[PDB]
Design a protein around this ligand. Sequence first.
Ligand SMILES: *[C@@H]1O[C@H](CO)[C@@H](O)[C@H](O)[C@H]1NC(C)=O
Lengths: 85, 85, 450, 204, 51, 51
Amino acid sequence: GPADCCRMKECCTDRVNECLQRYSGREDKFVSFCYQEATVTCGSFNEIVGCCYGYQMCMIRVVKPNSLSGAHEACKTVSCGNPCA
Amino acid sequence: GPADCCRMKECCTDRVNECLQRYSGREDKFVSFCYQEATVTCGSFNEIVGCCYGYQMCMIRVVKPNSLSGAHEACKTVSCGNPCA
Amino acid sequence: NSIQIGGLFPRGADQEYSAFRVGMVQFSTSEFRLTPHIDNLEVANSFAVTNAFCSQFSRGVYAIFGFYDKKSVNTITSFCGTLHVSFITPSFPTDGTHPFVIQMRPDLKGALLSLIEYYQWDKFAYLYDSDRGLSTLQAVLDSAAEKKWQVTAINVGNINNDKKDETYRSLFQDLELKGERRVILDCERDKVNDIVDQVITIGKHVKGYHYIIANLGFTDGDLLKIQFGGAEVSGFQIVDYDDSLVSKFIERWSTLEEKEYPGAHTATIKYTSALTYDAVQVMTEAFRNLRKQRIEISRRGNAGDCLANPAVPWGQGVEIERALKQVQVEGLSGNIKFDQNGKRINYTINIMELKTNGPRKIGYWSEVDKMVVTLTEEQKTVVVTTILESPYVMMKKNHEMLEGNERYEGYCVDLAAEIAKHCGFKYKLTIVGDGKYGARDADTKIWDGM
Amino acid sequence: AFCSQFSRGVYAIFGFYDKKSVNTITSFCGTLHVSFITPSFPTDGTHPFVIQMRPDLKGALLSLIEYYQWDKFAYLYDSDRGLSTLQAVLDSAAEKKWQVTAINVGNINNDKKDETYRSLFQDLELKGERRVILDCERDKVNDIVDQVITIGKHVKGYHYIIANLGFTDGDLLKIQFGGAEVSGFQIVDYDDSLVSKFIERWST
Amino acid sequence: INVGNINNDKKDETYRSLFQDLELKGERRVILDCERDKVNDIVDQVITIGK
Amino acid sequence: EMLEGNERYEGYCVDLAAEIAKHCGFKYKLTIVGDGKYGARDADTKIWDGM
Ligand SMILES: *[C@@H]1O[C@H](CO)[C@@H](O)[C@H](O)[C@H]1NC(C)=O
């Protein structure tokens, strides 16, 4: 049962987004929580790094309250970086 | 610049295929060579593993002489597995 | 029962008219006799074609046999379509639905594509010119997109013969670049021969290359040039000389005097001329079937001016057309029958491969069955590369007095002797040039060493 | 019609031709030394006694492809203006590293064509190809456009290149808001004073 | 959102602004409660903006 | 006795098998050879016995 980092990435972004959608206006606060849930749901090659690290950083630095949709839409294509470190 | 496992995969399959195209009819012999060249051009997180390992395996066992196109088309969606070890 | 039929022979076409005359003699009957009016013209010239067509028309011919070019073919189709005059041609089949045209030449598309599928070609190069039209090109492109083929389409017709030397060298250079070996030539026989000569000149006829000549004249041209080159060549043959009909016809053809019938003294015959002969057969049998069905197509008065506006066609023409299309006969091209549109049906294209001893038929192609296959068909000194390492390979003290494998001593030397001894070959010990074991250069990406 | 004009003793002829009829025109005008001027597509070769008003589009298109840096795309053509452009871009694809998918949309009959386009763009979905070049007359262009909008491929991520001099001659309002990039060629600049004045007189 | 108070003569960009504001929230799932005419209008506008 | 399939066996060759199968991307079912021999050629019948 291979994880396939690309599929892992698409899953990661998708789960993060779908999670952040539940929190309206608090979106910028819960980024890390939803990233935790996403890393849990999609699995990870390195439990510390998570499914996609670059997307998480991108979201944390970009996402502002109520700005969710556009921010995510901008951040979902970003490079995830090194999945093992 | 930044590393992306997904970009690495999509690049990997293409470079492998494009490499095997020059070797038409001897294609089943050169899978590993072209995989080396592709791993070099697209980069890899672990020099041993390569850009996409599962695709390489799938190609190695599936690819028959002149059957390349169908083989690659079948193998390019395959899970790369863990690009750590 | 004099039947007036016009005909158009391109200047320089001899064996075609020769086989036409032979056809006139052989298929002649006491019942009726065809009275041909031959007109020589420039086939590529539309004006000339128009003039000749209207000339034959005003002469009141019941049918016309001729040739056309990519330029002139629309003139023929349109005029024959308007004036309801039947036209029979050996020239390339029209792509579309064209009435009042009887195309003797079979469709080569199926045979070619089935051949590609037979050889399992994933990627190849396609060399074409615009003469017979781009119909085949369109076909192989659409089938390439459907079957996921990567095809290199290159037009060799637009290159001027005066300046074409380095153009072809550059062509096959660009073609060698990608390592693409498989090559298909769809061209006129002249252009074919030119490209061939350029290939032997550039030494691309060596082993590893596969050429596919698309035409019905595969054995009509000289195959002796690339025969010994060592490259595989395949093609299509519309005339089987193993058949009794073709064999006897060939005996009579070869006994003919060259002075009376130009270029008619030969072992073989060009497929176009053969198609002409078969066309004569088709016309004779058609009018015979018209007389047996008791239908009189005889003209009451002269046709008048073809360009007279508005044009009025004669009624009989349709009957003559149907008469021609309903014909089914046996000839040099194999079984001859036509559909409603006038294209060939149920033909047989022999699939042939050029071998060392000569050409041979490897199979046949049918419109239905597609490809069907016919009958299924010293020691070199081994170079041993090694590097100097102790005590694996070392130079003897006296080595200057010795030569070859006696120069070296070591573990690997003895092991080499043993391997060669059990595997039974002669071996030559050599030291690697760069003096490395093996490696991949990060820059050139080239493997160096043994 | 040509011989009709000829016997009337005309000094020149202005007209149009088709892939079928163009050889008739060239041969007759070349033979009878009558000048022919046409807006229709330029003949490929050296034809005397023909003045072709339409400019050559090949160079502009190829330069545009090199400008957008397209490595792989799909090329949609018809047999109406001829395959000259197709042959050209195929030769330049052979010279470059281009991967080109050539598909003939001209042999498809308009009465029965619904699923023909669905299958076409299905095959286009096979390779995932988002770059497409349309070489066609404005009618086929418009039809193909409607078919694109119907299946919703006119959204962002797609890039269409229309090859003709009529880029603003067809209706672009349909795909204008879709969010897909569209590029094309214009032989008439309405910003010019001459053209502006002509349009002012034209609209009245 | 009330789509009934929009006059047909000036209504082009009103729908673009509507669905832009709807893109703000990322809202995909949408329920149309309308007369068949307004339904057709909104649908066509949806096809135009490729939603 | 409480387990089934590949969970029944443990050992070096077992782990190695898991690794090889994991690398080659196939599902594997561990089975013990019938005759309980490694391999041999009978000099008379010329039949191979064992794995
Ligand atoms: C000839 O080909 C047609 C299809 O074009 C097929 O229906 C027919 O059966 C064939 N006839 C023979 C004798 O093979």
